[PDB]
Amino acid sequence: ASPFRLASAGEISEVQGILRTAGLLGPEKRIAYLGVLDPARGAGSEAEDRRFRVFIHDVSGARPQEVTVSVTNGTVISAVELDTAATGELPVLEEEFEVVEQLLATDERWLKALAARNLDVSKVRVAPLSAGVFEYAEERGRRILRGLAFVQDFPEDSAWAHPVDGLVAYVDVVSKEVTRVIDTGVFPVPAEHGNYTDPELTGPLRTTQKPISITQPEGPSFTVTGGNHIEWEKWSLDVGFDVREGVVLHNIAFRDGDRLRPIINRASIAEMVVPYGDPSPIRSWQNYFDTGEYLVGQYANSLELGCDCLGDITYLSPVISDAFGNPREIRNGICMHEEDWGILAKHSDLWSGINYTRRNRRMVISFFTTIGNYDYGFYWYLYLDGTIEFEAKATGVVFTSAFPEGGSDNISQLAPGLGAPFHQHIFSARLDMAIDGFTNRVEEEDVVRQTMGPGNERGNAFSRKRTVLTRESEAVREADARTGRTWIISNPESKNRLNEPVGYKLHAHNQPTLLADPGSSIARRAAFATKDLWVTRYADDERYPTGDFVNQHSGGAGLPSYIAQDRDIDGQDIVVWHTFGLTHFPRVEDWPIMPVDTVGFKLRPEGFFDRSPVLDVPAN
C-alpha cells in the first residue's frame, strides 16, 4: 500500500518484462542502474504509480539510454539516448571489473613489465579502478578503467601487502583494448605478508575476553509494518534502499502529543569521494566516487547475527536488479535494533530532596559495503530526545604502494618497503528538510564576542548572531569552529509556545574539506567537497551533488550548476547538503587491517518542542 515500500522481486521482474516487450533489453543490453523513483510533491493525488528509473548500457558500443518505467501500468514513460562524451558515462558494471585482469594477462607490454620484475603473471592481481578525466584525448566517449597490480603469493594471501609500484595500465572495457601501459621504473615488491588470520602474525589468540550478553526478553520496542515502516519511541519513518545511495530514510517524523510532526522528508548519503594525495603518476589520477561511480548499495554485505550486529536484531533483505534485470536479494543486508545509551537526564536536588535519573536509548539502522580494499559502515541513529545522528565507520585494508628509498612527503611507511598514500574519505549528506512542513529556511549561527566597556563593564558578556540565507547564491557556507558556527533549519510559519519559529540545529565535526588544488580535475568533479554546507531549492531532478552520470564526467553538473539558478530559499521547500569527511594519514597501527575510524554529524532540536520531549520516560 505505502508508496515508499521497498522494491519487490516482482517489481524488478516486471521492469525486466516491460523493457523486453518494448525492445529496450535485448541480449546486448545491461542494466547499470535500476531504482524506484520517489513520489512527486503532492501527498495522494495519483493513488499509486510505482515508477522505476533505469540506466541501460549497450555492450556493442551503441549509445546507452535512460528509461523511466511505470510497473503499475506496464508502460515505458520515457526513453532518452545519452551522449556520454557530453553528460558522462554510466556507472561501472560488476562484469567489467573482471575484464581488466584478463585483458592485461595477454598484452605484450604488460607481460614485458612483469618479466622485468621477475613476477609470474598468474600471481598478479589487478585492482580495476575508475578512470576520471585527465589529459588523454583518446578516452573521450569511451569506457575506461585503470589497473594497478598486486602480487598474491598463494590463493589465501592478502595481495594488498605486495603492491607492484611503477606500473599502471589503461583499458577500454567495451572494445577490449589496452590503450596504454605506463612503466616508470622497477620498485622492490614488499615481501612481508599481511595475513591477519595467520597465527604466525596474530600470535596466540586472547583467552581473556568474557562474553557480553545483550538480550531483550520481551522483544524490541519498535514495530515494523508494511515491510519497512518503523515506529519507535514517538519516531515514525520509512527505511528505503537504493542500489546507488544505499539506505535512504523517508518521512522522518515525531509524534508530539496527537500531532505527527515532520522533520526530514528524505535523508541519504548522496555521494562519497576518496581522493588520493600522492603526486606519483602511478596514482595521481586515483579518486573513487564510491556512490556515483560504483554504487555502494550493490556491494552491501550480508550481516551476521552476533558478529556484525549484536542484540535483538530485525533484518531487512532489500532486492536489487542484476545486470540482466533479474532480482537479487541482499540477505540480511540491513540491521535494525535499539541500544542502551547511558544516562539521559539526572539531577539530585538539595532543596526538594528529589533524586531523578533516566536512561537514554537509540534506534540504529545500519548497513556495510565493501568496495575493493575498503569497507564502510553507514549508521543512522535516532535518540529519545529528538536528536538524529549519522556516523560512517571506515575499516578494511589501506591502499598501498612502495615506500621510496629516500622517504616521501605524501606516503606513510607501514612495514619495510611498504607505503600507504595519504588520502581523504569525504561524504555528502543530502537532507531534504521538512521541519513541521515544507516552508523552511536556514540560518547561520555564530558566537559573538563583546568588548569590555559601557553595558559590559566587567567584560563577561558574549552573545550570538543568526544570519538568514535568502538565496542560493549566498547559501554556500564554510565551517568556523573557532566561532562555534552551526546552522539552524527553522519553519518561520510554525511557532512554539514562546512564539519563536521551531527549528533544528546542525552540528558539524568541522573536519578539513577537499585539500586538492582548486584547479585540479578532482576539485572540479567533486566541487561539493570544497565547502561544508550548501542549500538548494528542492527540484525533482537535483538528486546528487555530482550529477546523474559521474563516471568519466568533467565538471559542469551537480551543485555548482544548481546554485546558479539563485532561487529563493527563505521559507521554501529546501534541501541541505552537508560535506564531512576524514583526512587519513595512515599509521602503523592501520596495518595489516585497519581498526574503525569514524566521522559524522548530528541534528538536535532547537525550540522545536515546547519543553523537554522526554519528561514521560519511565524510571526503568
Annotated binding-site members: 288-299, 371-376, 423, 425, 584
Decide if 541 is catalytic.
Answer: no
Tell me if 349 contacts a copy of itself by CB under 8 A.
yes
537, 567 in Cβ contact below 8 A?
A: yes
Secondary structure of residue 258 in the 3-state scheme: coil
**Cell representation of residue 286:** 586515483
Surface-to-core class of residue 306, CB atoms within 10 Å of its CB (0-12 exposed, 13-18 middle, 19+ buried): exposed
> What's the CA dihedral at 448, 452, 457, 461 to 10 degrees?
20
Taking CB under 5 A as the criterion, the residue among 178, 230, 384, 433 binding Na ion is 433
CA atoms within 13 A on the CB side of 47: 2
**CA–centroid distance for 258 within its chain:** 35
- Please choose, out of 87-95, 283-291, 424-432, 549-557, the segment that lies near Na ion by the rule CB under 5 A: 424-432
> Least distance from C-beta 282 to a copy of itself, angstroms?
12
String marking each residue 521-550 x if it binds Na ion according to CB under 5 A: -----------------x------------
105 binds, among a copy of itself, Cu ion, Na ion, none (CB under 5 to 8 A by kind): none
Taking CB under 5 A as the criterion, the residue among 432, 444, 472, 548 binding Na ion is 432
432 binds, among Na ion, a copy of itself, Cu ion, none (CB under 5 to 8 A by kind): Na ion
Smaller CB distance to a copy of itself: residue 45 or 620? 620
The Cα–Cα gap between 509 and 615 comes to 29
476, 534 in Cβ contact below 8 A?
A: yes
Q: Which of 151, 132, 146 is nearest to 180 (CA)?
A: 146
Q: Looking at this protein, which amino acid is placed at residue 369?
A: T
Smaller CB distance to Na ion: residue 44 or 155? 44
**What is the dihedral sign for C-alpha 116, 120, 121, 127?**
negative
> Least distance from C-beta 274 to a copy of itself, angstroms?
12
Q: Which of 430, 420, 619 is nearest to 533 (CA)?
A: 430
User: Which ranges of 7-146 would DSSP assign to H, the alpha helix?
Assistant: 9-21, 84-87, 94-104, 108-116
The arrangement of strands across the sheet holding 401-402 comes to: 401-402, 418-421, 411-415
Taking CB under 8 A as the criterion, the residue among 83, 459, 539, 561 binding a copy of itself is 459
Tell me if 218 contacts a copy of itself by CB under 8 A.
yes
The Cα–Cα gap between 89 and 139 comes to 11
> Least distance from C-beta 425 to Cu ion, angstroms?
6
Site for a copy of itself in 483-512 (CB under 8 A): 483-484, 496, 498, 500, 510-512
Site for Na ion in 383-412 (CB under 5 A): none
- Please choose, out of 13-21, 61-69, 345-353, 560-568, the segment that lies near a copy of itself by the rule CB under 8 A: 345-353
> Least distance from C-beta 321 to Na ion, angstroms?
29
| Length of the chain (residues) | 620
Tell me if 520 contacts a copy of itself by CB under 8 A.
yes
Site for a copy of itself in 143-162 (CB under 8 A): 152, 155-159
Taking CB under 8 A as the criterion, the residue among 26, 42, 185, 217 binding a copy of itself is 217
The Cα–Cα gap between 423 and 374 comes to 13
**Cell representation of residue 243:** 542500489
573 binds, among Cu ion, Na ion, a copy of itself, none (CB under 5 to 8 A by kind): Na ion
Smaller CB distance to Cu ion: residue 400 or 440? 400
Smaller CB distance to a copy of itself: residue 157 or 573? 157
The residue assigned the cell 579518486 is: 287
Residue 102's φ and ψ, nearest 5 degrees, are -65, -45
326, 338 in Cβ contact below 8 A?
A: no
Site for a copy of itself in 253-282 (CB under 8 A): 275-279
> Least distance from C-beta 597 to Cu ion, angstroms?
8
Q: How many residues bind Na ion (CB under 5 A)?
A: 4
String marking each residue 401-430 x if it binds a copy of itself according to CB under 8 A: --------xx--x-xx-----x--------
Decide if 504 is catalytic.
Answer: no
Q: Which residues contact 464 (CB under 8 A, 6 or more apart)?
A: 445, 446, 447, 448
DSSP assignment letter at 141: T
Tell me if 229 contacts Cu ion by CB under 5 A.
no
Tell me if 283 contacts Cu ion by CB under 5 A.
no
584 binds, among Cu ion, Na ion, a copy of itself, none (CB under 5 to 8 A by kind): Cu ion
The Cα–Cα gap between 253 and 255 comes to 7
- Please choose, out of 42-50, 72-80, 381-389, 576-584, the segment that lies near Cu ion by the rule CB under 5 A: 576-584
Taking CB under 8 A as the criterion, the residue among 5, 125, 180, 328 binding a copy of itself is 125
Secondary structure of residue 152 in the 3-state scheme: coil
Active-site entry in 33, 276, 374, 379: 374
Site for a copy of itself in 184-203 (CB under 8 A): 196-197, 201-203
Buried b (16+ CB within 10 A) or exposed e, 149-180: bbbbeeeebbbbbbbbbbbbbbbbbbeeebee
Smaller CB distance to a copy of itself: residue 54 or 104? 104
- The binding site for Cu cation comprises 423, 425, 584
Active-site entry in 290, 548, 573, 590: 290
The Cα–Cα gap between 393 and 599 comes to 7
Smaller CB distance to Cu ion: residue 543 or 584? 584
- Please choose, out of 80-88, 174-182, 446-454, 566-574, the segment that lies near a copy of itself by the rule CB under 8 A: 446-454
Residue nearest to Na ion (CB): 573
The Cα–Cα gap between 438 and 429 comes to 19
Tell me if 362 contacts Cu ion by CB under 5 A.
no
Taking CB under 8 A as the criterion, the residue among 46, 95, 120, 304 binding a copy of itself is 304
Taking CB under 5 A as the criterion, the residue among 244, 584, 592, 605 binding Cu ion is 584
276, 533 in Cβ contact below 8 A?
A: no
Interface ranges with Cu ion (CB under 5 A): 584
The residues assigned a catalytic role are: 290, 374
Interface ranges with Na ion (CB under 5 A): 432-433, 538, 573
